[PDB]
Design a protein around this motif. Sequence first.
Motif, mmCIF file in Angstrom:
data_model
loop_
_atom_site.group_PDB
_atom_site.id
_atom_site.type_symbol
_atom_site.label_atom_id
_atom_site.label_comp_id
_atom_site.label_asym_id
_atom_site.label_seq_id
_atom_site.Cartn_x
_atom_site.Cartn_y
_atom_site.Cartn_z
ATOM 1 N N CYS A 79 0.820 -1.203 0.000
ATOM 2 C CA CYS A 79 0.000 0.000 0.000
ATOM 3 C C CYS A 79 0.855 1.254 0.000
ATOM 4 C CB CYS A 79 -0.936 0.022 1.201
ATOM 5 S SG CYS A 79 -1.902 1.533 1.276
ATOM 6 N N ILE A 80 0.457 2.208 -0.829
ATOM 7 C CA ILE A 80 1.161 3.463 -1.007
ATOM 8 C C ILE A 80 0.263 4.643 -0.673
ATOM 9 C CG2 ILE A 80 2.803 2.566 -2.670
ATOM 10 C CD1 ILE A 80 0.897 3.035 -4.783
ATOM 11 N N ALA A 81 -0.809 4.389 0.082
ATOM 12 C CA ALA A 81 -1.658 5.428 0.662
ATOM 13 C C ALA A 81 -2.289 6.320 -0.399
ATOM 14 C CB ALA A 81 -0.874 6.268 1.665
ATOM 15 N N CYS A 82 -2.694 5.725 -1.509
ATOM 16 C CA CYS A 82 -3.207 6.511 -2.617
ATOM 17 C C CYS A 82 -4.694 6.791 -2.513
ATOM 18 C CB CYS A 82 -2.917 5.801 -3.931
ATOM 19 S SG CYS A 82 -4.095 4.554 -4.373
ATOM 20 N N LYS A 83 -5.396 6.104 -1.611
ATOM 21 C CA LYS A 83 -6.800 6.336 -1.276
ATOM 22 C C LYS A 83 -7.743 6.092 -2.448
ATOM 23 C CE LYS A 83 -5.437 9.622 2.249
ATOM 24 N NZ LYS A 83 -6.474 9.464 3.296
ATOM 25 N N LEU A 84 -7.323 5.298 -3.434
ATOM 26 C CA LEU A 84 -8.244 4.900 -4.492
ATOM 27 C C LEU A 84 -9.316 3.960 -3.967
ATOM 28 C CD1 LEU A 84 -6.488 6.333 -6.498
ATOM 29 C CD2 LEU A 84 -6.512 4.312 -7.929
ATOM 30 N N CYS A 85 -8.944 3.050 -3.068
ATOM 31 C CA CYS A 85 -9.925 2.171 -2.447
ATOM 32 C C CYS A 85 -10.918 2.964 -1.615
ATOM 33 C CB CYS A 85 -9.218 1.131 -1.585
ATOM 34 S SG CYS A 85 -8.167 1.794 -0.290
ATOM 35 N N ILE A 96 -8.588 6.209 5.689
ATOM 36 C CA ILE A 96 -7.153 6.196 5.438
ATOM 37 C C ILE A 96 -6.551 7.509 5.911
ATOM 38 C CG2 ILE A 96 -5.357 6.082 3.691
ATOM 39 C CD1 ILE A 96 -7.200 4.424 2.011
ATOM 40 N N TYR A 111 -5.297 2.632 8.345
ATOM 41 C CA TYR A 111 -6.094 1.972 7.317
ATOM 42 C C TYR A 111 -7.153 1.161 8.049
ATOM 43 C CZ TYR A 111 -7.121 0.116 2.711
ATOM 44 O OH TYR A 111 -7.726 -0.196 1.520
ATOM 45 N N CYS A 128 -7.238 -0.946 -6.532
ATOM 46 C CA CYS A 128 -5.883 -0.846 -6.018
ATOM 47 C C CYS A 128 -4.888 -1.027 -7.151
ATOM 48 C CB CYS A 128 -5.646 -1.883 -4.935
ATOM 49 S SG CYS A 128 -4.109 -1.663 -4.037
ATOM 50 N N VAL A 130 -1.707 -1.544 -6.983
ATOM 51 C CA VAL A 130 -0.506 -2.270 -6.596
ATOM 52 C C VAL A 130 -0.878 -3.579 -5.919
ATOM 53 C CG1 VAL A 130 0.977 -0.267 -6.421
ATOM 54 C CG2 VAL A 130 -0.462 -0.911 -4.523
ATOM 55 N N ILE A 133 -4.721 -4.045 -1.195
ATOM 56 C CA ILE A 133 -5.929 -4.510 -0.533
ATOM 57 C C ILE A 133 -6.552 -5.607 -1.384
ATOM 58 C CG2 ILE A 133 -7.258 -2.588 -1.551
ATOM 59 C CD1 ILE A 133 -7.933 -4.356 1.808
HETATM 60 S S1 SF4 Z 1 -6.020 1.550 -3.378
HETATM 61 FE FE1 SF4 Z 1 -4.315 0.198 -2.655
HETATM 62 S S2 SF4 Z 1 -2.424 1.503 -2.617
HETATM 63 FE FE2 SF4 Z 1 -4.256 2.883 -2.769
HETATM 64 S S3 SF4 Z 1 -4.670 3.487 -0.586
HETATM 65 FE FE3 SF4 Z 1 -5.990 1.670 -1.087
HETATM 66 S S4 SF4 Z 1 -4.812 -0.200 -0.446
HETATM 67 FE FE4 SF4 Z 1 -3.373 1.588 -0.526
#
Ligand code: SF4
Lengths: 178, 342, 114, 48, 157, 102, 126, 208, 52, 145, 99, 96
Positions: A79-85, A96, A111, A128, A130, A133
């Motif tokens: 996880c890179i904290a991108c908040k797409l999820c 997040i 998270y 996600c 990467v 999740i």
């Molecule tokens: S979509 Fe993936 S990389 Fe982005 S914040 Fe959520 S778990 Fe982290």
Amino acid sequence: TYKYVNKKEQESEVDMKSATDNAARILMWTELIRGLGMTLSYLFREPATINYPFEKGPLSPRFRGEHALRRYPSGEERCIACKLCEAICPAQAITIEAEPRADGSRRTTRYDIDMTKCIYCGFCQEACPVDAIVEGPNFEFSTETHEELLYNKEKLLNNGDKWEAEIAANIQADYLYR
Amino acid sequence: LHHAVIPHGKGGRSSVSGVVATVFGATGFLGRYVVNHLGRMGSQVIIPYRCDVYDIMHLRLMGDLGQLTFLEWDARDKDSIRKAVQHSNVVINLIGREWETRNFDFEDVFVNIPRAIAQASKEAGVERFIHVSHLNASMKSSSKSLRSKAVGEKEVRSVFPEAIIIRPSDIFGREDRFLNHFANYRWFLAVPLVSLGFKTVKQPVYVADVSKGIVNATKDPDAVGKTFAFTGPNRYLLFHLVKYIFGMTHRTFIPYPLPLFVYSWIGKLFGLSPFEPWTTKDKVERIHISDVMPTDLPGLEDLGVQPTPLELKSIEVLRRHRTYRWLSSEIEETKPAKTVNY
Amino acid sequence: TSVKPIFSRDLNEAKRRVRELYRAWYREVPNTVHLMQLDITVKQGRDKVREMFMKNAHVTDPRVVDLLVIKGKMELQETIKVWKQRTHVMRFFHETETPRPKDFLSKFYMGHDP
Amino acid sequence: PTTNPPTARKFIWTNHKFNVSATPEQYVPYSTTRKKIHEWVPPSTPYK
Amino acid sequence: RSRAEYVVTKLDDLINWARRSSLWPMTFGLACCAVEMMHMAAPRYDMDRFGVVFRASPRQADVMIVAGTLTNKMAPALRKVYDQMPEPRYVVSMGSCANGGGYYHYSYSVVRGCDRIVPVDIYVPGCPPTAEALLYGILQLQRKIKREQKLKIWYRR
Amino acid sequence: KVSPPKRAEMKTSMESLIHHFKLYTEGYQVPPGATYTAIEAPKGEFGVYLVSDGSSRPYRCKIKAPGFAHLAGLDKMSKGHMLADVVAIIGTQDIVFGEIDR
Amino acid sequence: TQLITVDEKLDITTLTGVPEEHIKTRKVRIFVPARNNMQSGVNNTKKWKMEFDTRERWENPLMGWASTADPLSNMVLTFSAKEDAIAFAEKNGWSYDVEEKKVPKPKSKSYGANFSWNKRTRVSTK
Amino acid sequence: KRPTVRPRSDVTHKQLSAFGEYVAEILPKYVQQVQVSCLDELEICIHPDGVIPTLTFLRDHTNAQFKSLADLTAVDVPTRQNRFEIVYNLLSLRFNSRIRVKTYADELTPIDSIVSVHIAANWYEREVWDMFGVFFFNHPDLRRILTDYGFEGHPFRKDFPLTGYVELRYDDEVKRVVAEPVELAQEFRKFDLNSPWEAFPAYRQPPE
Amino acid sequence: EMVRKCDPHIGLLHRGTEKLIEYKTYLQALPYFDRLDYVSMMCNEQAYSIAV
Amino acid sequence: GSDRSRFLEGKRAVEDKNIGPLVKTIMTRCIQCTRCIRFASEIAGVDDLGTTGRGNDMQVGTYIEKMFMSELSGNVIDICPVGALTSKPYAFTARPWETRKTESIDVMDAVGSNIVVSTRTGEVMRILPRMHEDINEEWISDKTR
Amino acid sequence: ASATRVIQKLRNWASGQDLQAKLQLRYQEIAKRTQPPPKLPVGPSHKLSNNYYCTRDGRREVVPPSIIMSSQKALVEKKAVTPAPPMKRWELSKDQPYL
Amino acid sequence: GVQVSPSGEKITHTGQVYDEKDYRRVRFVDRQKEVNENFAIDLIAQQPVNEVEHRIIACDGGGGALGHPKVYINLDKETKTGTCGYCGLQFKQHHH
Ligand code: SF4
Ligand SMILES: COC1=C(OC)C(=O)C(C/C=C(\C)CC/C=C(\C)CC/C=C(\C)CC/C=C(/C)CC/C=C(/C)CC/C=C(\C)CC/C=C(\C)CC/C=C(\C)CC/C=C(/C)CCC=C(C)C)=C(C)C1=O
Ligand SMILES: NC(=O)C1=CN([C@@H]2O[C@H](COP(=O)(O)OP(=O)(O)OC[C@H]3O[C@@H](n4cnc5c(N)ncnc54)[C@H](OP(=O)(O)O)[C@@H]3O)[C@@H](O)[C@H]2O)C=CC1
Ligand code: SF4
Ligand code: SF4
Ligand code: SF4
Ligand code: SF4
Ligand SMILES: [K+]
Ligand SMILES: [Zn+2]
């Protein structure tokens, strides 16, 4: 095109043999007897009941179960904290918070997934970029209090560490379709 | 103050009231109302429990998520007591039985356990301790329970000098053992009152009023080190009180004068039961002890609670004990009991 | 400043409809208290009805008064035919809800809400 | 997983745990962030 | 320990065995989660094989499986049929709606979890949880009420 | 710009990554307009009256369920019938309540 | 016979069902939202918005979430015109603050000014 | 030809335009606008006084025969004087067609109910009243149909908050299910998911 | 046991689905249609998908 | 733009610069639009930024290891359209769809610059300017930001 | 499938149907749970030329609806028409017209 | 690595731990505060620096489509390794 389910075509007239057949049908309960025979056949069939918990119903690698946070093979969090999820979560079940780590890495400090709020739709794992999740195939995680279903980052990372031997195999079997 | 104990919100279910309260008698009759008020304003309520988790299930919905912390405790386990009171700024003591078991008697229940709780609270350095005694439990009373509560008051004051001592009268409520007790007197032929229920004055107090007083004692800065007397607004003779109870039940009313020694004998006979007894000798003695008139002690008004009258809150208790014929009877169809100024 | 009426041309027959609705509520309160096992008395229910009418008493628009009468008749029907339960009827009293004090000092001590 | 064992990783749990609900090993949620607002600490020396 | 303590423990085991081998849910459901509940009733999983049989009246029910979205209009009815169940009763919340509101958490007409209305014994997560997961929750409830020590607590009183 | 790209394309291509980001954060913008789309559902005609204001969120979404009209017509179908007949009529109307209540 | 006269304020607060606190104690703001300075796009500065005054958000003790107590915290209403937003606010009985639309000023742009013979607008780099 | 674009047939557009002209010239007293969308859907926007004549004509005319009301709904656009746009989608099985009839209302001007034209309009108008507060004249029994008993306010309005104003919980002191002012453990996080760049130049409104 | 009048009171499973849909995006509003008719999930998905 | 890429080659990558603890530079994202160069030349008036190199190797920044620190230096974080010049205090903290916008006034000086306070979940996350032609135009001071 | 021939004949006679040909329990005819990896095809827009997005932008070909008549814009012997030609009568099924 | 507070409570990889006087440790009384033992910062510190030859390297985290989006790291600074912004792997250019 169309067809009739109950409309009868013309008439069968009246005959002594047909009248006797209808009389025997009414008096001797013939359709009731053949319904009994159908139930008897089902009695002498083999039941479709599995021996839970010693036998489990079949599933697929696509199955959406308990959430987990995965890692790279090095052990770094994916996880890179991108908040797409968090953005795509239809129930707003993901919270997040993030900051740069001690080495400058872009990582989450919070998270949380409210599994009582989550609808188990897989939008987080398909948004996600990467594969951090995922919905691993665990479904037998029922608890006795409402609090234990409020997952945080430690719980999700522990789930990812517990189920990595199965989640990685499912993603290997599935990723060419997605 | 700590940053996590500063109050926040508008006082609802999800708010923070800044109250971290360890409630010890939370599984009983008064305890459920106290926990309900604390969780309603939004508070961290620690419930040390002794009974079954099924028996504490009814408390589980009285607060928000994570605001009620249930933990097992033993009355003989000082470690359990101190781990219960370790993270708290208010410790509320509602421990009490109306009878004696083969393990715990009145002396242990009303002296030793309150002293242990107050000692653990003082060692853990909690800010506020609230202890529920009884009204007219002064000393040298005719019943063992009231003398035990008096000695317990003295011990709690000796250990924790600024303990708020709350002395309520005979509490009535939905799950009480006062109105339900006098209503369950209907299962026998008559009502055996001592001296026909006269020369015995009572002013019962509503359980919600007592619980509001306890919560306002948790929050009140001027309540520290004081003894409060929680009484209802009207004093009744025991005869008129039982007559009003049976009138609200619409059942019947046949009083009977029974002398106190044989009444204590039959109370003892009921009390020799392995389960919860219907009545005991101590129970009938506390029934026939008159309530003192609180003159110098502060009360519900001084803690900010208006005493709701028994005439107003009576039908929520006694409608269950009616038959089908009188089930849909209103408040005004029962004549209120005559009050006495003394 | 000229609008289409709903039921009332002016405020007089609107107040007539209000009086009719109040009459119906006043008659229906004892039946409700007898039928639903309510802790309240008949005096408290009529006081609550009067309190609701006086809460809405400040309006002077005939259309708004007509719609208030229509809503009151809907709630009256929901009470006549037992569709509101004991909880729904007792929701008018707010007996479990503590009231926010109206003074500046208490609002200052409680929080930031004016 | 005897003819086809899974990929071995150093962070994978070596000992599986079952459902630990209503046990002392159960999961308890908490906020994983640190404190955001820092209060002013008054000095420990009196002004006069 | 004492000989009577052992007898009380064995009586507790017997009572818990009876109550966990005979769990009758109320014929009560609200939504898609109740569809999965009748898929648990279906021949694959056989709650009847486990001893779990639906009864329509709450008086004959032992457990209440809250399977669906508990709305504001439904909450008094749910509380009523819970209260009308006799005393050895349990509650299994099923699905995200009954657990914590789920997909309708921020709705004006949805109770945010049935634990605001009734005391929930066991929470089953999912949307919907599979019939496997609901059966797992039922077995977990059986273990939970196997853990009960009512006569032992009464003796230690 | 409407459907998300494949994950390999997203992880190897700039345009695909941008479109994946925007589709899974904001979503596609639907041009403003109103439609009523009716589909032969098993329980009847399932309709959606969608009104789009030009943004990535629908301005209005009315759901037409056949069970709504069928349950409205339940009282007419039950004239001169008994309790078991009413049970049969409720069964034969193919009634589910999620789409009725929404 | 089907047209009456009403000389009033058009008050529907008794019909909206809003509690009295969230009518009297509430302040609304009617404004064209400012252009987000991280972008150059101006399509979000076209419509009037009415929002409410910010109330208390505190920390949830269990999880650290942002708990709130007012219902009108996410309420943003979109209007085509300032007077339309005025009419809606007066109709629903909310006190309002109105901010006039900040249209960007017209600017004289000349590419040849970057290469001026004598003026100071001559640039030193490109 | 293009695999990603919907095919377009002009015959449906021509037929719907001709029928819109037909209805508009038949009923000039009530019809205010007639439009055909690029999705081949006919919309007729009428005065609220002509709801009963327009619906009756569309149901009973030989060339219309819109005998089935698909649905009745409302759209809250709180920037016009008449904020509620009432929409009737109707189906003609005889001609295999669908039509849409629109009218307008505000909070204080009720419109005529069409229960005498279609019986489904009973529950549909009950839903419209319950969710928007648009009263309907001559309804046989108008009341709430989806909200709780004693619910205050019409929740499908734009200004009504998503979570509402009250929430229910079981209070053990009163042994009831009671209503409290709403408090959320986690506030609904609103998102600003609007690109600052114009997406559709065909819908560019002229500047004010 | 004859039936003189039926009055179906509904809304006991009303969850404000249309309001939540109008407060969410299109892909976010898709899985509401699974739960509208929870026996015809793919059919409601198809209906919403064809509309969009 | 289009919805897909035809680029089948390898991309370029540029080493980052260290112009200061306010502006974080990830210059691989830079599209060489010279907005920062023009801003620092014309409004900040420092003439420290520029382009070194040629062709596809043209890089924006300072040729020497120089700390670009004047006042009004977070406005390059504002006007950089890509995330090449981001804010180091704001790094990785929030997202714009998360952030609620509150239009307020700056009090760090007596200019009275109109600002937007970006707050997420009841916590102040960012300060951005607001367009007011008569006070602060499009920019705020570094102390304000 | 493990039923004896006596029980199979009894079931077939009692049901009237040949149950063994169509068993409701899956034994071996189902697909294997492990499958070879797929290789999904690409769409028609996966090409490196003549693939400009403006030539396939179906989303931006939406126009505002055409006003047939308006009370403000227009400010206002032919045959009567219908919304469509009348629907042709369905033909009865040639496969199974009656049950 | 997992460190303990003076209160004895484990400190998470985010550095979160309750204070001594914080009342919210009562949620861990008679229960456990579970902390993920494998700290990703230490685990990625344990990885050796990949010695490559080119001036620009490409990283996708390994596994191709199973990794992160493919990025390019410029190894021009000889005094500092280039770190992949997604996976945290470090690369250094071999100038020998
Ligand atoms: S979509 Fe993936 S990389 Fe982005 S914040 Fe959520 S778990 Fe982290
Ligand atoms: C799509 O839309 C929707 C619906 O629409 C379709 C819905 O419906 C709906 C609601 C959905 C639900 C509520 C789900 C419910 C599920 C179903 C309807 C499907 C399940 C099916 C059934 C219930 C049918 C079951 C049929 C059967 C044949 C099972 C048998 C059941 C029985 C009740 C009969 C058997 C009896 C029992 C189990 C109890 C018997 C035993 C006893 C009482 C014991 C008595 C014995 C003694 C006392 C003897 C004692 C004496 C002695 C001497 C003993 C000696 C003792 C010693 C100790 C020595 C929803 C929400 C919905 O959205
Ligand atoms: N009720 C009344 O009329 C009045 C009561 N009081 C006093 O107020 C207090 C609360 O009253 P009330 O609710 O009626 O009392 P209860 O009879 O309901 O019991 C109170 C609580 O004490 C606990 N308790 C009792 N003995 C023990 C023990 N040995 N070890 C551990 N816990 C124990 C019980 O727990 P568990 O269920 O697990 O055993 C219960 O939760 C008591 O001190 C009582 O004397 C004062 C005036 C009037
Ligand atoms: S599965 Fe869906 S509802 Fe659950 S966390 Fe992921 S995006 Fe949210
Ligand atoms: S949790 Fe999901 S499946 Fe269960 S009732 Fe709610 S929407 Fe339906
Ligand atoms: S403003 Fe940004 S994109 Fe433009 S030249 Fe400067 S660093 Fe590059
Ligand atoms: S968000 Fe913009 S600046 Fe950042 S990597 Fe993507 S395209 Fe480049
Ligand atoms: K930037
Ligand atoms: Zn990498």
